[PDB]
Amino acid sequence: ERPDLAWLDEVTMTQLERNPYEVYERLRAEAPLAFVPVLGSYVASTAEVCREVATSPDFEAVITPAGGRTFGHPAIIGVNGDIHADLRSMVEPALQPAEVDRWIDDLVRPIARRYLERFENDGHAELVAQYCEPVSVRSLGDLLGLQEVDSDKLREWFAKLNRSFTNAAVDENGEFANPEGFAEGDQAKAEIRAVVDPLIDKWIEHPDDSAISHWLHDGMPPGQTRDREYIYPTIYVYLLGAMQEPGHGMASTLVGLFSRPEQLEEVVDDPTLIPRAIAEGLRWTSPIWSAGARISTKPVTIAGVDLPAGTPVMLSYGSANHDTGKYEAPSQYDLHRPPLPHLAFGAGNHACAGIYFANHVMRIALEELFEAIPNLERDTREGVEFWGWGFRGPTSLHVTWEV
Ligand code: HEM
Ligand SMILES: COc1cc(C=O)ccc1O
């Protein structure tokens, strides 16, 4: 509807999935808050606007249309008030820093070693499928109580939920343009139910130290549990983003380091720099790139746009993390970038609950990788492609090393 942005009418969903950075560079300059027709929503592209919307008292949580179609209610990312307070209290115990420090090393390090031992003497590997994704899902899967669900299956589930959650394209009338793209999300949920319903049956009668068992029991009156239908949407939140994003983050960090071979050498030589390398990695390609949204609760003015009450705004944190008002040459990976705040974990009341855990998973995984393969190099015979608008990461990461 905005005349000078008529070019946005020609932006396609495929373009945003393959490479959103050119469109979003224009948005950050022309319209930090803009309606994108193919997404059917206002989008916030700059750090100032994302931060304001995510922390404003005049906005509250909502799920995107395709996200809500995929997860239903009450997904922790999309609720407010008393329900959100309860779901936050439910997930937070195992994520508390002092608790994570008690067991994170004994959890992740043996998992990383197990997967590394399968290929560390081959001289070649595709690290997304052989290392980054397995370590991410096996670590969280064991924490949750899903020890008997294979990492192949956890990876398949987050991939299907990813595509369903981000099936956001809409047509002229604002209707989903690809309604059949939700079917594999529905099929993944059906499989998850078949596996998890018996585990919940068991945990209700025999609680244990698994996180989902504690979700059922913690804070409840004696003999009561949270109803499974009340917690399943937050289980899906985990089985998508919590399973996927640490693997995305460590892979993007590696791609970034490979693009700066001098900096990769530094980090291999001095592993205490791995946390700094990961933080730049998350800024450089944010795993949660534009998955979330807020909705206005009152009429509000943002970036010169007068929004009525009830207006959704998508939070494109991955674009915000390339805001040239903050960073110099943000499209380049730079380990020695001055440490600044970033928005890869969001902001406000709905900011990431698992930051401390996620950073440790990524750190320990990179530590063990660089120890087992110090002469790791990227297979330049292959190129690295990134995919995703809602969630973004490399689709593969071929490497080689002298055995
Ligand atoms: C590098 C890995 C990760 C990244 C980049 C990431 C990023 C984010 C982002 C951007 C949000 C939305 C924040 C907002 O809307 O302002 C979020 C929400 C959330 N994340 Fe993380 N995440 C990561 C890993 C994890 C892990 C491993 C867990 C659990 C163990 C987790 C648990 C959560 C939860 C529960 C929420 C919802 C918070 C709420 O709505 O109140 N995250 N995360
Ligand atoms: C932490 O996992 C999730 C986070 C988000 C944030 O927008 C969306 C879907 C997810 O599964």
Residues 6+ apart with CB under 8 A from 221: none
How would DSSP label each residue in 10-75? Answer: G--HHHHHH-THHHHHHHHHH-SEEEEGGGTEEEE-SHHHHHHHHH-TTEEEE--HHHHHHH-TT-
Q: Give dist(CA 104, CA 271) in Å, integer.
A: 18
Pocket residue to mutate for ligand 2, from 69, 77, 234, most atoms within 8 A of Cβ:
77
**Residue nearest to ligand 1 atom 1, measured at CA:** 246
Residue 182 in contact with residue 167, Cβ under 8 Å?
yes
The atom number, within ligand 2, closest to the CA of 354 reads 1
Q: Give dist(CA 93, CA 89) in Å, integer.
A: 7
Measured in Å, residue 349 CA sits from the centre of ligand 1 at: 12
Q: Strand 377-378 vs strand 300-302: parallel, antiparallel, or unpaired? A: unpaired
Residues 6+ apart with CB under 8 A from 328: none
Lookup result for tokens 């809409």: 170
In this structure, how many other beta carbons lie within 10 angstroms of the beta carbon of residue 213? 20
Q: At what angle do helices 261-269 and 355-372 cross, to 10 degrees?
A: 90
Type of residue found at 194: A
Burial class (CB in 10 A: 0-12, 13-18, 19+), 55: middle
Measured in Å, residue 222 CA sits from the centre of ligand 2 at: 31
Q: Give dist(CA 5, CA 32) in Å, integer.
A: 12
**Residue nearest to ligand 2 atom 8, measured at CA:** 291
Q: Which 3 state secondary structure label does DSSP give 147?
A: coil
The atom number, within ligand 1, closest to the CA of 358 reads 27
The atom number, within ligand 2, closest to the CA of 352 reads 1
Residue 50 in contact with residue 320, Cβ under 8 Å?
yes
Q: Give dist(CA 283, CA 307) in Å, integer.
A: 29
Burial class (CB in 10 A: 0-12, 13-18, 19+), 141: buried
Type of residue found at 183: A
Tokens of 158: 């987050």
Q: Which 3 state secondary structure label does DSSP give 394?
A: strand
Q: Give dist(CA 338, CA 319) in Å, integer.
A: 19
Q: Give dist(CA 197, CA 199) in Å, integer.
A: 5
Domain span at 38: 1-403
Give the determination technique. X-ray
The DSSP code for 206 is S
Lookup result for tokens 């949920």: 189
Q: Give dist(CA 325, CA 28) in Å, integer.
A: 10
Q: Which 3 state secondary structure label does DSSP give 321?
A: coil
User: How many degrees, rounded to 5, is the angle at CA 238 between CA 192 and CA 272?
Assistant: 135
Q: Give dist(CA 317, CA 346) in Å, integer.
A: 7
In this structure, how many other beta carbons lie within 10 angstroms of the beta carbon of residue 260? 18
What is the chain's length?
403
Pocket residue to mutate for ligand 2, from 137, 236, 240, 317, most atoms within 8 A of Cβ:
240
Residue 13 in contact with residue 385, Cβ under 8 Å?
no
The total number of structural domains that make up the chain: 1
